[PDB]
């Protein structure tokens, strides 16, 4: 009747996220061991991980954006010597990842999201800096045309992005070694980013899920601990609010809306590289690794 959830095959951090057909994705990433191109998919009605089609090559501190339905997933590092990677899109349909040559750069931890039909990749890194980017840049994979875009106020990278209401929304990372809890917000309308409310908490590495009209913020690197702090974002107020803490916490993991459902999956939590899973509830505003199995002929599920 109750369980804890089943964790990944593999560990990872660095990894990309996303819902695709109310299942939680997680690509890539990487471990103490070794770089990920392997794609796992969790069902949260069978409570199963399964694979996808592996991505060409290993990829770790990516980020992933669902474009029109599909998965996309640029920039990222191997440990095969080879700084460029081409850009690849996920088609459901067919479990198979298509090349996207236009998308190929060495670009790492920036954040990658969609708006308007179209692909933004904003701050970031080259694969050896630790100095941030402000640059932001806009693909459209209809007319595969880049665009220029305006650049941020404060160089960043690790940052979460996310898009809401017709924003972007790029929150904490880093420049240098210095943690953030600025926040910017991009206007497509006139091509403007403007600082909101700042985080409670300076954070690189956090991951963003959108749900009920906010954003929420859960784990990252605070300059001293990998933590497991939640702080939603209501943009009505235009202010921050500490929620419920993570079971575990999590630096540079996977976090995702699946249904309306937050999800949390992987990380780094100072000592160790995770592969653990666990759900936010929003009414009651607390974590679990718990799941309730569900049964379908008598006392039948999908454990056996």
Same mark, same amino acid.
């Given at each position: 009747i109750e369980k804890p959830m089943s964790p990944m095959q593999y560990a990872r951090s660095g990894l990309g996220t996303a819902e695709m057909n109310g299942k939680l994705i997680a690509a890539g990433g990487y471990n103490r061991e070794e770089?990920?191109?392997?794609?796992?998919?969790?069902?949260?009605?069978?409570?199963?991980?399964s694979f996808l089609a592996p991505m060409r090559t290993p990829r770790a501190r990516f980020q992933m954006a669902v474009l029109m339905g599909q998965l996309y997933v640029v920039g990222g590092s191997n440990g095969h010597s080879d700084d460029l990677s081409c850009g690849e899109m996920y088609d459901s349909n067919i479990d198979d990842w298509i090349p996207v040559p236009e998308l190929r750069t060495n670009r790492c931890?920036?954040?990658?999201?969609?708006?308007?039909?179209?692909?933004?990749?904003?701050?970031?890194?080259?694969?050896?800096? =630790?100095?941030?980017?402000?640059?932001c840049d806009v693909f459209d994979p209809v007319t595969k045309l880049w665009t220029s875009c305006a650049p941020l106020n404060i160089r960043r990278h690790q940052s979460a992005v996310c898009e809401l209401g017709g924003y972007l929304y790029i929150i904490g990372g880093a420049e240098s070694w210095n943690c953030l809890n600025t926040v910017e917000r991009y206007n497509p309308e006139n091509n403007t980013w403007t600082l909101i409310?700042?985080?409670?908490?300076?954070?690189?590495?956090?991951?963003?899920?959108?749900?009920?009209?906010?954003?929420?913020?859960?784990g990252g690197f605070d300059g001293s601990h990998a933590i497991s702090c939640v702080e939603m974002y209501d943009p009505t107020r235009n202010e921050w609010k500490m929620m419920g803490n993570m079971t575990s916490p999590r630096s540079n993991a996977g976090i995702a809306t699946v249904?309306?459902?937050?999800?949390?999956?992987?990380?780094?939590?100072?000592?160790?590289?995770?592969?653990?899973?666990?759900?936010?509830?929003?009414?009651?505003?607390?974590?679990?690794?718990?799941?309730?199995?569900? =049964?379908?002929?008598?006392?039948?599920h999908h454990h056996h």
């Open positions: 770089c990920l191109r392997t794609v796992e998919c969790y069902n949260p009605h069978t409570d199963h991980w931890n920036a954040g990658v999201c969609a708006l308007n039909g179209k692909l933004y990749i904003v701050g970031g890194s080259d694969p050896y800096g =630790q100095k941030g980017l402000k640059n409310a700042p985080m409670n908490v300076a954070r690189r590495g956090a991951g963003v899920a959108v749900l009920n009209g906010k954003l929420f913020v859960c249904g309306n459902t937050i999800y949390a999956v992987g990380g780094f939590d100072g000592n160790e590289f995770l592969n653990t899973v666990e759900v936010y509830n929003l009414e009651s505003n607390e974590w679990s690794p718990y799941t309730k199995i569900f =049964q379908f002929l008598e006392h039948h």
